[PDB]
Each structure stands twice: as structure tokens, then as C-alpha cells.
Amino acid sequence: MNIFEMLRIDEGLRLKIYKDTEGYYTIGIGHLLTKSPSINAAKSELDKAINAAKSELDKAIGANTNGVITKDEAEKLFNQDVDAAVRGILRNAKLKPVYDSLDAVRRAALINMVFQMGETGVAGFTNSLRMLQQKRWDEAAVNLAKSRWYNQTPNRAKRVITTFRTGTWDAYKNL
């Protein structure tokens, strides 16, 4: 197991644009494109938002994709996105010290969170980050669960939290 295999499990692989639970048009392995409108929001708005997502996809791929990509293309966006997530952690004054303090498995758990919620979002878990830096694993696990993050994607959150708790890949075995 490594960060790529871990995120591949949590994000899945879809070759056509889809909407994730947070209302974002997404494709590949968790590659976010743009935000979608309301289930109501006009018949027009809907189509505009769809083309806006396709526009973002084409720009990212450098081709006229019409919302469909190949596995190789999804993996290319994925490599870029993982690198970007790590790069962001390293450039963030709050995340870097925690990241540097962690072992390799726990570092993957933090990259996973950043990949899902973005750098500023994770930098906001001030109390959990402190508990992680103090190696207070169980307390960090309890604090991390008291979040919209956990309530919205509990099964994934539980795997990430278990990884921080144990420092092992147990939550991802048989997956």
C-alpha cells in the first residue's frame, strides 16, 4: 500500500464526468472540475455548468474530450493531483510541521485528507493537527470524527482516521 493505491481506493475511477457528494463535477480518480448548480437551478444553468466542467476537463487534458477520458489520462491527472497535494502541504505553514513530524503511513493519511478537502480545509483542523503532532493518536481520532468531513463521508473518514490512529494500512487491506 502507498498513497496512490490508498487514494485509488477512496476516490475510485470513473471515465466519464460525474457529480460527487459535495455537488462537484468530477472525473477520473477524484479530479475535481467545477461546482454544479442546484437540483432546481434552471434548465439552462444546468447545461452551462456541464459545458463549464467539460471546458475545465479539456483544458486539463489538452484535448477535446467531451467529458470522457481514458484510464491513462485519469492516471495522468491523478499523478499531477497527488503531487500538487504534497506540494501544498509542504508550502503550508500549519501542515508542514505536522507532516514532517509523522511517519510514512500517517503522512499518507494527511495527504489523503488534503487531496479530498484541499490544503486550507485541512489546515483548519487546528486541534486535530496539534494532537497528531503530539502523537496523541486516540485523541486525534476522536477529534477528527467531530466534523462535517466525517458526517458526509464516514466510511472513508473512518479509514483515514484509523490510519492516523494505528500507523498501519489495516483499514485498506482487502480493499
For residue 8, give the C-alpha cell.
Answer: 485509488
Closest C-alpha to 23, from 121, 152, 143: 152
Amino acid at 32: L
Residues annotated in the binding site, as ranges? 32, 115, 128, 143
Q: Which positions are annotated as active-site residues?
A: 11, 20
- Rg of the chain taking only CA atoms, in angstroms: 17
11-17 long-range contacts (CB < 8 A, ≥24 apart) are: 11/115, 13/71, 13/74, 15/68, 15/69, 15/70, 15/71, 15/74, 16/67, 16/68, 17/50, 17/53, 17/54, 17/57, 17/67, 17/68
Q: Structural domain tally of the chain? A: 1
For residue 81, give the C-alpha cell.
Answer: 493531483
Can you give the chain as a three-state secondary structure string? CCHHHHHHHHHCCEEEEEECCCCEEEEECCEEEEECCCCCCCHHHHHHHHHHHHHHHHHHHCCCCCCECCHHHHHHHHHHHHHHHHHHHHHCCCHHHHHHHCCHHHHHHHHHHHHHHCHHHHHCCHHHHHHHHCCCHHHHHHHHCCCHHHHHCHHHHHHHHHHHHHCCCHHHCCC
Q: Residue 155 maps to which CATH number? A: 1.10.530.40
The answer for 37, left when phi > 0, alpha when psi is -120 to 50, beta otherwise, is beta
The CA–CA distances, whole Å, from 44 to 49, 51, 53, 54, 151 equal 9, 11, 15, 16, 32
Tell me phi and psi for residue 19, to 5 degrees: -110, 125
Q: Which domain holds residue 156?
A: 1-175
For residue 29, give the C-alpha cell.
Answer: 480518480
Rounded to the nearest 10 degrees, what angle do helices 126-133 and 137-144 cross at? 160
Resolution value (Å, 1 decimal): 1.8
Residues annotated in the binding site for substrate, as ranges? 32, 115, 128, 143
CA triple 97-128-103, angle to 5 deg: 50
